[PDB]
């Protein structure tokens, strides 16, 4: 199937409570592989998956240099943005940046991303063509012009279509045993009586990887969403994920209902009945 590499960077100002705290995390698909926390002991980019420990010292030195520089740009940005929006020096604010690339089943480039948020809303984003910018508001036009004049988009395009894709491939190879695994969901259904009048059917999916999954209810083989509840896919803590979907049914009618499970670890979609 398809794969992605993504980096996520967050800084929060807290005036009167020191300088901003910065956190960076890197993922391949749903697996975290590096972290940096500006207040942690090491002051280095740190490994979070076994296969990244294959990288030598030049890598750790370079990734540390880059992530520390990024922490400092986020610090400068918090100041700049307070100015742009005419804000007090008293409030706490948040900057976020995400970037990375997607590849398909052939491991070739599908798309790249590079985008920024201020205080929980869009600020500026690279468009899909990797040549132009979407400014979210009037203030962001100033940054758009700055980045257009400095030819940032061209530099980002080269990374996203080149380095990003190559390093994602390298990681997939180096961590094949785990990253290229597909753990099919362990599935079952439970039944609980709401009263004499209705019961809840709950369809479980456990121990699966990657996180992408679809759970759907049908009644008489017809798609049903009314009287259903679907929880957000959640991490188990061991590298795998969990999800459930439930439907409330009239007593005596449980057999009309089926749960349908789609996951890449499955040769064919599964159907469950009570």
């Amino acid at each position: 199937g398809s794969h992605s590499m993504r980096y996520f960077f967050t800084s929060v100002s807290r005036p009167g409570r020191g300088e901003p705290r910065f956190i960076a995390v890197g993922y391949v698909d749903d697996t975290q592989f590096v972290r940096f926390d500006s207040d942690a002991a090491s002051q280095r980019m740190e490994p979070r998956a076994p296969w990244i420990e294959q990288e030598g010292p030049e890598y750790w030195d370079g990734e540390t240099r880059k992530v520390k520089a990024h922490s400092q740009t986020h610090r400068v940005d918090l100041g700049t943005l307070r100015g742009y929006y005419n804000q007090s020096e008293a409030g706490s604010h948040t900057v976020q940046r995400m970037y990375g690339c997607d590849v398909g089943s052939d491991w070739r480039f599908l798309r790249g991303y590079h985008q920024y948020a201020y205080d929980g809303k869009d600020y500026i984003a690279l468009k899909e063509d990797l040549r132009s910018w979407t400014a979210a508001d009037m203030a962001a036009q100033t940054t758009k012009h700055k980045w257009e004049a400095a030819h940032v988009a061209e530099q980002l395009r080269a990374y996203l279509e080149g380095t990003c894709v190559e390093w994602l491939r390298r990681y997939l190879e180096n961590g094949k045993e785990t990253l290229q695994r597909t753990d099919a969901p362990k599935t079952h259904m439970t039944h609980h009586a709401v009263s004499d009048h209705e019961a809840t059917l709950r369809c479980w999916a456990l121990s699966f990887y990657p996180a992408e999954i679809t759970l759907t209810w049908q009644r008489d083989g017809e798609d049903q969403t009314q009287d259903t509840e679907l929880v957000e896919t959640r991490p188990a803590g061991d590298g795998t994920f969990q999800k459930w979907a439930a439907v409330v049914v009239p007593s005596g009618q449980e057999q009309r209902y089926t749960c349908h499970v789609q996951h890449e670890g499955l040769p064919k979609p599964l159907t469950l009945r009570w």
């Binding site: 980045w147 990374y159 380095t163």
Partner: peptide, 9 residues
């Protein structure tokens, strides 16, 4: 691997 550029808003 991170991008090798520094940018400020």
């Amino acid at each position: 691997r991170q991008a090798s550029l520094s940018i400020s808003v």
